[PDB]
């Protein structure tokens, strides 16, 4: 998914990245041990691939 400005004002955006304390959630909810996220812009861009970490 995506968005870009129509409002012509500056915009402030927040998001998050899930780090479960156990795996049974991770399989049960999302059904991948793979994490790969890519939140991207022109200036900024970053990816995320975390694990369980108790």
């Amino acid at each position: 998914k995506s968005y870009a400005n129509n409002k012509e004002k500056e915009v402030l955006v927040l998001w998050g990245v899930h780090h479960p304390p156990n795996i049974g959630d991770q399989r049960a909810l999302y059904h991948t041990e793979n994490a790969y996220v890519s939140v991207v812009s022109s200036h900024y861009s970053r990816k995320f691939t975390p694990e369980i970490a108790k």
């Epitope: 304390p21 049974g24 959630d25 049960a28």
Partner: single-chain antibody, 236 residues
């Protein structure tokens, strides 16, 4: 949520035999969505199966099923006279409404909750019930109040997520009223405008781990655990 239809509501079969039961609805409905129960009359329900495949804790391997979309199915590998019982079909709506298949007798041929207050009232009158919690975190789970006439198909009275999105039926709504307390570890159901449709037994029921907390507690979209229920009746 959608009308189910079990198949059959009662069957008669012999030892050393399988048993196929098919609970199917109006629409096609996504398959980690149903859970499957048994009851000995006199006993409360017990949980067996969920999501058309998979199996609950403390078990043999014989009750096993399949099926998807409109037609969900639980089959059985072997029949035994200890299995003499009515098996049920409970599904979580997306309109967050449990719906109930009407019980399926097998005849074989030759931690805890506590309810509070079941009994009599006058019809058209007023009375309250409660439940109280023992040995867990009543914070987390999505709760349900449920009804059951004797030897009949069930009906679902009400349930509520821990954020506040209620679900009632359009007929039951308003006449009952739920309210919940986590710090006290208890639940409340104030009830008014009561007629003979309520002449039946009820249960308090603990369902779904919402998204998160610490514990050795996974989740399904089935129940967790039940209570022993109690009777309620209008009569004069």
């Amino acid at each position: 949520e959608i009308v189910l239809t079990q198949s059959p509501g009662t069957l008669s079969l012999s030892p050393g035999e399988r048993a196929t039961l098919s609970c199917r609805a109006s629409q096609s409905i996504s398959g980690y969505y149903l859970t499957w129960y048994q009851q000995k009359p006199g006993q409360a329900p017990r949980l067996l199966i969920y999501g058309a495949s998979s199996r609950a804790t403390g078990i043999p391997d014989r009750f096993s099923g399949s099926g998807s979309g409109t037609d969900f199915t639980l089959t059985i590998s072997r029949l035994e006279p200890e299995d003499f019982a009515v098996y049920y079909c409970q599904q979580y709506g997306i309109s967050p409404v449990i719906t109930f298949g009407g019980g399926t007798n097998v005849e074989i041929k030759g931690v805890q909750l506590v309810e509070s207050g079941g009994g009599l009232v006058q019809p058209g009158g007023s009375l309250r019930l409660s439940c109280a919690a023992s040995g867990f975190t009543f914070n987390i789970y999505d709760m349900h109040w449920v009804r059951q006439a004797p030897g009949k198909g069930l009906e679902w009275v009400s349930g509520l997520t821990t954020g506040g999105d209620t679900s009632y039926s359009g007929s039951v709504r308003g006449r009952f009223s739920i309210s919940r307390e986590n710090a006290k570890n208890s639940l409340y159901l104030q009830m008014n405008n009561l007629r003979a449709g309520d002449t039946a037994a009820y249960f308090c029921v603990r369902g779904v781990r919402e998204v998160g907390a610490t514990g050795g507690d996974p989740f399904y979209y089935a129940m967790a655990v039940w209570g022993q229920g109690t009777t309620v009746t209008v009569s004069s």
